[PDB]
Design a protein around this ligand. Structure first.
Ligand SMILES: [Zn+2]
Length: 320
């Protein structure tokens, strides 16, 4: 009750999107909840979701947004044995870690490099997943939300059909979700897991340890004239940033948004609209775009990397 609202407010205030979870159906209240893994918080939406949680809804934090992944370990006891108490305390000291309702642990981190979709499972032990990486198109239930195990069906619930309630709770204290080198954390987990037979799943390993693109971006383009694209978007009720940049011809500096963040969100929207041709994208970006306003050697690395990441994110999202 009080903790559910206290922490949802904390997340919103730190720039994180939350999504309301219907405590009757245990599922998101919103139809396209996956979009909150990658769109920008709207202040009115923030305000509405907070009120829903005050009214009794649970809430969830989607992965992907802002570089967030949540490492969702089935068993806190297992994680302690796997990495040791000292490494676990360092991790809980560096960033937010929470207890989950069925005895696991969530470790929330930001990273510059994260996968374009959840990886479920991330590590396996005796052929079975024991931790999922929650990234885009996935979420975790939020601090302060609770569950009555009387209504659990999965056999992961130790208390299935007992009238017993537990909650997502602080593992120690509340601290800001911190940035880490995720690939480096994952390599550390793998190193520590070797002696226990805890190993990266195939999908994890291929993300971690391992342009034909342009042609595929061009090939998948819609591929209308730029003027038609502007007309179509501007008559589709776009989000605030998109309206400003695509329809109102404002710069990132005009609307006082970070260049990088502006490019990222504008590019996602366009690719979701079917505008994947890099030159069309470039033409629709404002003049202070980090893809334009840069020393030229940087300009191209940045644009390629951004397009590449955006497209992998859009592809997985549509597939979701
Ligand atoms: Zn349960």
């Amino acid at each position: 009750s009080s903790e559910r609202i206290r922490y949802a407010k904390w997340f919103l205030e730190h720039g994180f999107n939350i999504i309301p979870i219907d405590p009757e159906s245990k599922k998101p209240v919103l139809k396209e909840w996956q979009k909150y893994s990658h769109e920008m918080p709207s202040d009115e939406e923030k305000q509405r979701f907070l009120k829903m949680i005050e009214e009794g809804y649970n809430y969830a934090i989607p992965g992907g947004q802002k570089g967030l992944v949540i490492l969702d370990f089935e068993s806190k006891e297992k994680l302690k044995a796997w990495i040791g108490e000292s490494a676990l305390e360092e991790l809980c000291r560096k960033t937010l870690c929470t207890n989950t309702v069925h005895g696991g642990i969530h470790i929330y981190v930001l990273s510059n490099d994260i996968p374009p979709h959840k990886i479920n499972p991330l590590f396996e032990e005796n052929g079975k997943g024991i931790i999922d990486l929650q990234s885009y198109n996935s979420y975790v239930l939020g601090l302060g939300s609770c569950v009555n195990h009387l209504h659990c069906t999965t056999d992961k619930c130790p208390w299935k059909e007992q009238n017993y309630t537990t909650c997502y709770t602080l593992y120690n204290e509340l601290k800001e979700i911190s940035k880490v080198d995720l690939k480096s954390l994952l390599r550390f987990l793998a190193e520590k897991g070797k002696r226990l037979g805890i190993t990266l799943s195939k999908t994890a390993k291929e993300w971690l340890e391992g342009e034909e693109l342009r042609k595929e971006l061009v090939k998948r383009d819609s591929g209308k004239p730029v003027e038609k694209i502007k007309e179509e978007i501007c008559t589709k009720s776009p989000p605030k940033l998109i309206k400003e940049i695509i329809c109102e011809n404002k710069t990132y500096a005009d609307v006082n948004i970070d260049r990088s963040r502006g490019d990222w969100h504008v590019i996602l929207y366009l690719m979701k609209h079917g505008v994947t041709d890099p030159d069309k994208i470039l033409e629709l970006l404002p003049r202070d775009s980090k893809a334009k306003e840069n020393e030229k050697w940087n300009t191209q690395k940045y644009f390629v990397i951004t397009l590449s990441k955006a497209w992998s994110v859009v592809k997985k999202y549509l597939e979701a």
